[PDB]
Design a protein around this ligand. Structure first.
Ligand code: NAG
Ligand code: ZN
Lengths: 695, 195
């Protein structure tokens, strides 16, 4: 006499009240660890986390008992769909912890792996802060080369065997969950089956990402062409005005953001951009003044004040005493009305705008706090960091800084400073989209099985050249796993999170400013003192995950899908300026070019029998003897012609454009100096003294 | 001059859980209501039928003081015509209720580090409570069609749940001590007046 939906509603009310408490104990144990790192707080975190996990997996199996088909209510269907999702609960105890063994291994190898300087083997540098300091600050071609190649050789090669068993187990897990692959498993974040109209497919995410990207590529090419022209003045002798950009000159280890190339590509370095760090320390600004003035910004747009529990339990300063703390900035929704922010706040402009960003996460958390426990999250995986970023966009404006006293009433922004601002934004916002687009498409192909493991790197670099316009400084065979050199890849983190969020920011931003009656360019808007904008924004923040993200997006923008047009509208003043700066330039890259094809030797392997006969048919270790044979020829050459004892090894012979069993190119570098490529005719001389060679 | 013992109800060191809400009958005494409404200690002093003022001028044949502890989110349910886990299953006030509902924050007293789980509330019941009815039942609630046999199981849940009272919760989840004064005028001698 009681319907199944009535049985699951009773079951969910039974789940909600202990899940809300067990999740509060796990976060409180994790919070006390993050603000006080000890050896008994780690176990308290691991104990409460294991108790919270074991309870969730227990209810997750009892949730599959209820058929999702016989439930016509919609808000209740979402809690089951989120609870009936096993995850890795579908695998054997053998395969599960072997999978956990790989993920833990890939994390420590990433966080503890080092790269040693070829000039001093005793100077072995970690990524943070060692290698990142080099890749984010240095302008030396060779210094960035050994750090770029070293990180991917010493540490990246160790992740290749781990990532191969990783892809196999995660796909094996996803297929048991009735998914296509692990990439299709990730794309279920955006999948929606509502009644009609507000639906969303998983294959549709593939189509929408590609459609938006070809609308971004025009803006990216002129930015790529401009940065290429400006780095010629920084790196002459190393880049060609027609080919791709070397991977180790893009501002960081992977080229994720081009922000650190701003001093080299500044449009008008004569004029500095707006920095309010000095204006704050002269005004006696402290950590509480930053958050209280950030609090007055959200209440000015119609959002509630911060809780008093937020001002007593949050840690907004680094402890003065002996207390090691994690203070990578995070916003915490512990539950039961407990919201705090953990941050080593300094009196700087960057820490000023991140405060508005992390407080934006808090306002989002407090809004959907009235929803059931299984619906207390963003509409999709990109709404949270997008809502926080539109707060810093309006807070960093000259209009807002003019109102809070950090910039004088005698302020006027000229034509050049906004070109400086929009480019520094483009190096961070526009420069990461092709990198974010290609990394996920690569992992989507690998999970799907479209790219075999014997061509993982050969395809990875073909798309960096074609999609991102970035070329390897040295060729990487199938012993490298360069994608795994990123934090999000070696730690099982989805990366399309940062691509859709970027589209979601300016989609929200343009819609909120038209409500605020903003006139002029979009990068000049400020939603401050606009109640009708924040309350319209608060309408979506209340929904959380109770409604499909196409519905939640339409409540704010008036459209149910990703629209890149607001993003291109945000950078139109710069896109208009880059085109006139690129008239006498090349817009685009030639995929053929490389920093080493200038001195490499084409080689055509002799097919002494029909192709397809493994009688001889050179393979990987026949290439090993070849690279050792040329290494021997280079040893005799320098010793007999130059009286120089130089220990060439197979690792000095780099093979590129390798088509197995048929053809390849190769060049030679000096030991300990991958920057020093041996001249080609000097190498061809060593081969003549001791297949086809084209010349 | 027998003043009504309001100190034993309000200043009590420990209150009862709402599913077993405690009631004390106050009779043939002198009630000063000035100590109650003129006090800034209470966050909620909503009165129905009666008024906060014009209360030392009336005479009732009894006065009942229902005292209990709920969360801050559920204090709004202590009112005529309200719906919720407290009003439906724990403590229901009639539609024509004549009296005062008094509540105040007690994070100082009823919350503890690690958790305070001594306060309980009924989560499941076959039907809604009638006004001023108390249910201290402990039978296993059967939501489905199979008998529970007195043990917790699938679609068979224990009806009474505990509150999680840590001092770090938001005020919505913090403990609130509630006192409900009901005024009684009958065919009776009109015990309690108060100048
Ligand atoms: C509680 O006791 C204090 C003294 O112990 C007294 O001043 C106060 O009036 C009492 N409150 C009530 C409501 O009886
Ligand atoms: Zn954030």
């Amino acid at each position: 006499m009681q319907s199944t939906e009535d049985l699951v509603k009773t079951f969910l009310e039974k789940f909600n009240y202990e899940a809300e408490e067990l999740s509060y104990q796990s976060s409180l144990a994790s919070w006390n660890y993050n603000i006080n790192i000890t050896d008994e707080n780690v176990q308290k975190m691991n104990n409460a986390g294991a108790k919270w996990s074991a309870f969730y997996e227990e209810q997750s199996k009892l949730a599959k008992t209820y058929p999702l088909e016989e439930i016509q209510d919609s808000t209740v269907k979402r809690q089951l769909r989120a609870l009936q999702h096993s995850g890795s609960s579908v695998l054997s105890a053998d395969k599960n912890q072997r999978l956990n063994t790989i993920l833990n291994s890939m994390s420590t190898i990433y966080s503890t792996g080092k790269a040693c300087n070829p000039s001093n083997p005793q100077e072995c540098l970690l990524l943070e802060p060692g290698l990142d300091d080099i890749m984010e600050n240095s302008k030396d071609y060779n210094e960035r080369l050994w750090a770029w190649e070293g990180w991917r050789s010493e540490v990246g090669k160790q992740l290749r065997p781990l990532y191969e068993e990783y892809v196999a187990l995660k796909n094996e897990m996803a297929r048991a969950n009735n998914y296509e692959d692990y990439g299709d498993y990730w794309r279920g974040d955006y999948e929606e089956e509502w009644e009609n109209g507000y639906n969303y497919s998983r294959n549709q995410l593939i189509d929408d990402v590609e459609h938006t990207f070809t609308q971004i590529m025009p803006l990216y090419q002129h930015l790529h062409a401009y940065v290429r022209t400006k780095l010629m003045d920084t790196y002459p002798s190393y880049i060609s005005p027609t080919g791709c950009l070397p991977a180790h000159l893009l501002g960081d280890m992977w080229g994720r953001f081009w922000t650190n190339l701003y001093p080299l590509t500044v449009p008008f370095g004569q004029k500095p951009n707006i920095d309010v760090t000095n204006a704050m320390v002269n005004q006696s600004w402290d950590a509480r003044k930053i958050f209280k003035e950030a609090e007055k910004f959200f209440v000015s747009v119609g959002l509630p004040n911060m809780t008093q529990e937020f001002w007593e339990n949050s840690m907004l300063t680094e402890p003065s005493d002996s207390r090691k703390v994690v203070c990578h900035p995070t916003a915490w929704d512990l539950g039961k009305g407990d919201f705090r922010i953990k941050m080593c706040t300094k009196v700087t402009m960057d820490d000023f705008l991140t405060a508005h960003h992390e407080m934006g996460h808090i306002q989002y958390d407090m809004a959907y706090a009235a929803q059931p426990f299984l619906l207390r999250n963003g509409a999709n995986e990109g709404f949270h960091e997008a809502v926080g970023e539109i707060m810093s966009l309006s807070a960093a404006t000259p209009n807002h800084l003019k109102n809070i006293g950090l910039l004088p009433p005698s302020f006027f922004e000229d034509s050049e400073t906004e070109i400086n601002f929009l480019l520094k934004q483009a190096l961070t916002i526009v420069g990461t989209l092709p990198f974010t687009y290609m990394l996920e498409k690569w992992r989507w192909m690998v999970f799907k099985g479209e790219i075999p493991k014997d061509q993982w790197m050969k395809t990875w670099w073909e798309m960096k050249r074609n999609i991102v316009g970035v070329v390897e400084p040295v060729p990487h065979d199938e012993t490298y796993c360069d994608p795994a050199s990123l934090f999000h890849v070696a730690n099982d983190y989805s990366f399309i999170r940062y691509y859709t969020r970027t589209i979601y920011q300016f989609q929200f931003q343009e819609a909120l400013c038209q409500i605020a009656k903003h006139e002029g360019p979009l990068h000049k808007c400020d939603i401050s003192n606009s109640s009708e904008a924040g309350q319209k924004l608060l309408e979506m923040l209340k929904l959380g995950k109770s409604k499909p993200w196409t519905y939640a997006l339409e409540i704010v923008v008036g459209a149910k899908n990703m629209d890149v047009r607001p993003l291109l509208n945000y950078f139109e003043p710069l896109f208009t300026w880059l085109k006139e700066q690129n008239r006498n330039s090349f817009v685009g890259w030639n995929t053929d070019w490389s920093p080493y094809a200038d001195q490499s030797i084409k080689v055509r392997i002799s097919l002494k029998s029909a192709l397809g006969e493994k009688a001889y048919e050179w393979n990987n270790n026949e290439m090993y003897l070849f690279r050792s044979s040329i290494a021997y020829a280079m040893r005799q050459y320098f010793s007999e012609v130059k009286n120089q004892t130089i220990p060439f090894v197979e690792d000095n012979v780099w093979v590129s454009d390798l088509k197995p069993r048929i053809s390849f190119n190769f060049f030679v570098t000096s030991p300990g100096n991958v920057s020093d490529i041996i001249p080609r005719t000097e190498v061809e001389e060593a081969i003549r003294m001791y297949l086809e060679f084209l010349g | 001059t027998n003043l009504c013992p309001f100190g034993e109800v309000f200043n009590a060191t420990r209150f009862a859980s709402v599913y077993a809400w405690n009631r004390k009958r106050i009779s043939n005494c002198v009630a000063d209501y000035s100590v109650l409404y003129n006090s800034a200690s209470f966050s909620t002093f909503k009165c129905y039928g009666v008024s906060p003022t014009k209360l030392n001028d009336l005479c009732f044949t009894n006065v009942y003081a229902d005292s209990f502890v709920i969360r801050g989110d559920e204090v709004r349910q202590i009112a005529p015509g309200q719906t919720g886990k407290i009003a439906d299953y724990n403590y229901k006030l009639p539609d024509d209720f004549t009296g005062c509902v008094i509540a105040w924050n007690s994070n100082n007293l009823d919350s503890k580090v690690g958790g305070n789980y001594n306060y309980l509330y009924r989560l499941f019941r076959k039907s809604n409570l009638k006004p001023f009815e108390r249910d201290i039942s402990t039978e296993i609630y059967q939501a489905g069609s199979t008998p529970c046999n007195g043990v917790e199981g699938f679609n068979c849940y224990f009806p009474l749940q505990s509150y999680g009272f840590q001092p770090t919760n938001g005020v919505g989840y913090q403990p609130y001590r509630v006192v409900v004064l009901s005024f009684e005028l009958l065919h009776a001698p009109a015990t309690v007046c108060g100048p």
